[PDB]
Amino acid sequence: FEAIFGTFCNRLEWVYFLTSGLAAAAHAIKFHDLNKLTTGKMLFHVQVP
Amino acid sequence: FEAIFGTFCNRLEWVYFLTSGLAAAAHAIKFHDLNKLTTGKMLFHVQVP
């Protein structure tokens, strides 16, 4: 037998979130149990000057 | 390689002029070149019982 060859291509432009400057806007947090949560909240207390 | 396929090409079957059973009728004589043998005649000596 004799094969009919093709050709793979593999190189890609790898990109990372922390390497990007878009991460400067974000405060990344890896919370493994995230699917369990429904809705977070953050109360803010402010007396008037 | 997407696929494979076979190929083949046989050698021709051997035959020899002497191996043949027709060669028993023959009395072949190897010779360098039919050049000096100009005469077409050939003598023979027949004994008689």
PDB file of C-alpha atoms in Angstrom:
ATOM      1  CA  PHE A   1       0.000   0.000   0.000  1.00  0.00           C
ATOM      2  CA  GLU A   2       0.920   3.668  -0.387  1.00  0.00           C
ATOM      3  CA  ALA A   3      -0.607   6.547   1.576  1.00  0.00           C
ATOM      4  CA  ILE A   4      -2.091   9.826   0.316  1.00  0.00           C
ATOM      5  CA  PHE A   5      -0.461  12.284   2.722  1.00  0.00           C
ATOM      6  CA  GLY A   6      -1.987  15.414   4.187  1.00  0.00           C
ATOM      7  CA  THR A   7      -0.503  17.980   6.545  1.00  0.00           C
ATOM      8  CA  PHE A   8      -1.363  19.138  10.060  1.00  0.00           C
ATOM      9  CA  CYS A   9      -0.977  22.734  11.234  1.00  0.00           C
ATOM     10  CA  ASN A  10      -0.622  23.427  14.947  1.00  0.00           C
ATOM     11  CA  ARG A  11       0.913  26.829  15.708  1.00  0.00           C
ATOM     12  CA  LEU A  12      -1.466  29.370  17.263  1.00  0.00           C
ATOM     13  CA  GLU A  13      -1.213  32.793  18.892  1.00  0.00           C
ATOM     14  CA  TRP A  14      -1.483  31.813  22.544  1.00  0.00           C
ATOM     15  CA  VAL A  15      -2.992  34.482  24.795  1.00  0.00           C
ATOM     16  CA  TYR A  16      -3.418  34.759  28.559  1.00  0.00           C
ATOM     17  CA  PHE A  17      -5.754  36.883  30.655  1.00  0.00           C
ATOM     18  CA  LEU A  18      -3.139  37.882  33.240  1.00  0.00           C
ATOM     19  CA  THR A  19      -0.626  38.658  30.476  1.00  0.00           C
ATOM     20  CA  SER A  20      -3.115  41.090  28.920  1.00  0.00           C
ATOM     21  CA  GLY A  21      -3.530  44.632  30.168  1.00  0.00           C
ATOM     22  CA  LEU A  22      -7.287  44.153  30.176  1.00  0.00           C
ATOM     23  CA  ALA A  23      -6.727  42.367  33.496  1.00  0.00           C
ATOM     24  CA  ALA A  24      -5.776  45.707  35.079  1.00  0.00           C
ATOM     25  CA  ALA A  25      -9.472  46.623  35.095  1.00  0.00           C
ATOM     26  CA  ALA A  26     -10.321  43.290  36.756  1.00  0.00           C
ATOM     27  CA  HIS A  27      -9.567  41.744  40.141  1.00  0.00           C
ATOM     28  CA  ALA A  28      -9.395  38.085  39.127  1.00  0.00           C
ATOM     29  CA  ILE A  29     -10.570  35.499  41.669  1.00  0.00           C
ATOM     30  CA  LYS A  30     -10.562  31.699  41.265  1.00  0.00           C
ATOM     31  CA  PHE A  31     -13.527  30.499  43.354  1.00  0.00           C
ATOM     32  CA  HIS A  32     -13.958  26.787  42.658  1.00  0.00           C
ATOM     33  CA  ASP A  33     -17.498  26.513  44.106  1.00  0.00           C
ATOM     34  CA  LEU A  34     -18.870  29.301  41.902  1.00  0.00           C
ATOM     35  CA  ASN A  35     -21.617  27.214  40.290  1.00  0.00           C
ATOM     36  CA  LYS A  36     -23.227  26.663  43.705  1.00  0.00           C
ATOM     37  CA  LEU A  37     -23.763  30.376  44.389  1.00  0.00           C
ATOM     38  CA  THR A  38     -26.964  32.181  43.395  1.00  0.00           C
ATOM     39  CA  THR A  39     -26.385  35.924  43.869  1.00  0.00           C
ATOM     40  CA  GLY A  40     -23.685  37.776  45.778  1.00  0.00           C
ATOM     41  CA  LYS A  41     -24.160  41.166  47.384  1.00  0.00           C
ATOM     42  CA  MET A  42     -22.167  44.020  48.934  1.00  0.00           C
ATOM     43  CA  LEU A  43     -23.806  46.415  51.388  1.00  0.00           C
ATOM     44  CA  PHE A  44     -22.348  49.935  51.615  1.00  0.00           C
ATOM     45  CA  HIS A  45     -22.797  52.092  54.730  1.00  0.00           C
ATOM     46  CA  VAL A  46     -22.620  55.881  54.289  1.00  0.00           C
ATOM     47  CA  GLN A  47     -23.282  58.581  56.860  1.00  0.00           C
ATOM     48  CA  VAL A  48     -23.781  62.002  55.287  1.00  0.00           C
ATOM     49  CA  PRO A  49     -21.110  64.667  55.848  1.00  0.00           C
TER      50      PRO A  49
ATOM     51  CA  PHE B   1      -2.717  10.472   5.347  1.00  0.00           C
ATOM     52  CA  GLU B   2      -6.408  10.351   4.445  1.00  0.00           C
ATOM     53  CA  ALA B   3      -6.298   6.905   2.815  1.00  0.00           C
ATOM     54  CA  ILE B   4      -4.141   4.102   1.407  1.00  0.00           C
ATOM     55  CA  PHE B   5      -4.306   1.915  -1.696  1.00  0.00           C
ATOM     56  CA  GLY B   6      -2.320  -1.008  -3.058  1.00  0.00           C
ATOM     57  CA  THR B   7      -0.233  -1.214  -6.227  1.00  0.00           C
ATOM     58  CA  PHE B   8       1.605  -3.948  -8.111  1.00  0.00           C
ATOM     59  CA  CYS B   9       3.340  -4.755 -11.402  1.00  0.00           C
ATOM     60  CA  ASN B  10       4.571  -8.282 -12.160  1.00  0.00           C
ATOM     61  CA  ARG B  11       7.685  -9.389 -13.994  1.00  0.00           C
ATOM     62  CA  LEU B  12       7.023 -11.264 -17.229  1.00  0.00           C
ATOM     63  CA  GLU B  13       7.051 -15.048 -16.911  1.00  0.00           C
ATOM     64  CA  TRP B  14      10.378 -16.560 -17.935  1.00  0.00           C
ATOM     65  CA  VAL B  15      10.787 -18.686 -21.068  1.00  0.00           C
ATOM     66  CA  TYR B  16      14.028 -20.039 -22.546  1.00  0.00           C
ATOM     67  CA  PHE B  17      14.647 -21.279 -26.077  1.00  0.00           C
ATOM     68  CA  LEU B  18      16.515 -24.329 -24.768  1.00  0.00           C
ATOM     69  CA  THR B  19      14.225 -25.103 -21.810  1.00  0.00           C
ATOM     70  CA  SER B  20      11.326 -25.489 -24.251  1.00  0.00           C
ATOM     71  CA  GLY B  21      10.524 -28.983 -25.465  1.00  0.00           C
ATOM     72  CA  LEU B  22      10.530 -27.667 -29.021  1.00  0.00           C
ATOM     73  CA  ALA B  23      14.298 -27.248 -28.563  1.00  0.00           C
ATOM     74  CA  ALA B  24      14.767 -31.003 -28.989  1.00  0.00           C
ATOM     75  CA  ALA B  25      14.047 -30.396 -32.678  1.00  0.00           C
ATOM     76  CA  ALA B  26      16.668 -27.623 -32.576  1.00  0.00           C
ATOM     77  CA  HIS B  27      20.444 -28.104 -32.603  1.00  0.00           C
ATOM     78  CA  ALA B  28      21.446 -24.549 -31.697  1.00  0.00           C
ATOM     79  CA  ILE B  29      25.081 -23.435 -32.004  1.00  0.00           C
ATOM     80  CA  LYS B  30      26.239 -20.153 -30.464  1.00  0.00           C
ATOM     81  CA  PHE B  31      28.490 -18.121 -32.752  1.00  0.00           C
ATOM     82  CA  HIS B  32      30.175 -14.722 -32.749  1.00  0.00           C
ATOM     83  CA  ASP B  33      28.807 -13.128 -35.935  1.00  0.00           C
ATOM     84  CA  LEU B  34      27.347 -14.340 -39.248  1.00  0.00           C
ATOM     85  CA  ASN B  35      29.901 -12.470 -41.351  1.00  0.00           C
ATOM     86  CA  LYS B  36      32.662 -14.825 -42.547  1.00  0.00           C
ATOM     87  CA  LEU B  37      30.000 -17.517 -43.147  1.00  0.00           C
ATOM     88  CA  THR B  38      29.174 -16.205 -46.608  1.00  0.00           C
ATOM     89  CA  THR B  39      28.494 -19.534 -48.323  1.00  0.00           C
ATOM     90  CA  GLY B  40      24.929 -20.806 -48.044  1.00  0.00           C
ATOM     91  CA  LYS B  41      25.973 -24.376 -48.826  1.00  0.00           C
ATOM     92  CA  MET B  42      26.792 -26.930 -46.129  1.00  0.00           C
ATOM     93  CA  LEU B  43      28.366 -30.317 -46.872  1.00  0.00           C
ATOM     94  CA  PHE B  44      27.403 -33.608 -45.213  1.00  0.00           C
ATOM     95  CA  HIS B  45      28.827 -37.147 -45.316  1.00  0.00           C
ATOM     96  CA  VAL B  46      26.087 -39.805 -45.439  1.00  0.00           C
ATOM     97  CA  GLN B  47      27.034 -43.413 -44.735  1.00  0.00           C
ATOM     98  CA  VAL B  48      24.856 -46.098 -46.338  1.00  0.00           C
ATOM     99  CA  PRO B  49      23.926 -49.331 -44.511  1.00  0.00           C
TER     100      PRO B  49
END
